[PDB]
Point group: D2
Chain length 92, copies 4
């Protein structure tokens, strides 16, 4: 599912649809995506303190979506992230 | 891999090892985890602006790890997150 | 000047003008202001890494403005902050 | 008081005392300070949601202190910030 989301974001980078939010992000670039990540992270904290589980899930996925858009924008392969996740898993 | 990481974090919540970082987080609770997420998010922004890909990957995975620890702490099932990811995928 | 800014924000809390941004913040409440602070903090980081001094100043003042709005909203006296600043000054 | 804090931080940049936290920040540089600002910002959010006024004040001043350290580090004059605060005041 995470791989599916990443692939979809990658497909938008090659076949741009100005109407789409992902393309809007790619056009505005790195700084726009980073601002979104910071904003979304604050939203996760606020949602968590409000004990709103549905909102925590929406905002956390929002953070993940923007992180993936950022990866694609900086040309960082998803597998590099997955390797790190596996390495981190082993440590634990 | 993401599921593997989550399961491992869940296993630590039931079988505590005070020596482990994950248990340290569960003992300090919600507020400690949230602070980590905010700090890590800032580190992702800084790393991205420094154009340090390796660091972006480490910090992003760091953000994901703490988000998963937070899910376990708030008793939010991983599948709830995955459902949201799939729904988000469909929209795109 | 910081005191002037705070006083002005306080005056808006008592004499609401729906057209104003400050009143918009008070009406939406705590969670809206906090989201703004997180977003603005991310903008400060981004601006600083871009080496854009003018932007750093605008965003930093933005952070300060929202922190003062937050103080007024939570009914925290400015002098309490100033006492802390002075105490911090002495430590240094 | 804010000017006093800034002046004190400036004095530390010229007469370094490795034992001091301010000099520790200047030595580690921009990225360390920015990380602190992000972390502190999260702490302000968490403290505010906890309704802990004393903590909100400590963390907010912490954010201000690190912003001033950042100004000194980037060689941004305090009056530039004050000009912006006054301009912002007039707009209101």
């Amino acid at each position: 599912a995470f791989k599916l989301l990443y692939k979809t974001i990658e497909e938008r980078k090659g076949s741009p649809l100005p109407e789409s939010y992902t393309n809007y992000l790619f056009s505005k670039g790195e700084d726009k995506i980073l601002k979104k990540i910071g904003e979304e992270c604050a939203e996760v904290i606020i949602a968590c303190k409000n004990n709103d589980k549905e909102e925590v899930v929406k905002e956390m996925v929002d953070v993940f979506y923007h992180c993936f858009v950022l990866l694609a924008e900086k040309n960082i392969a998803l597998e590099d992230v997955m390797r790190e996740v596996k390495e981190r898993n082993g440590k634990l």
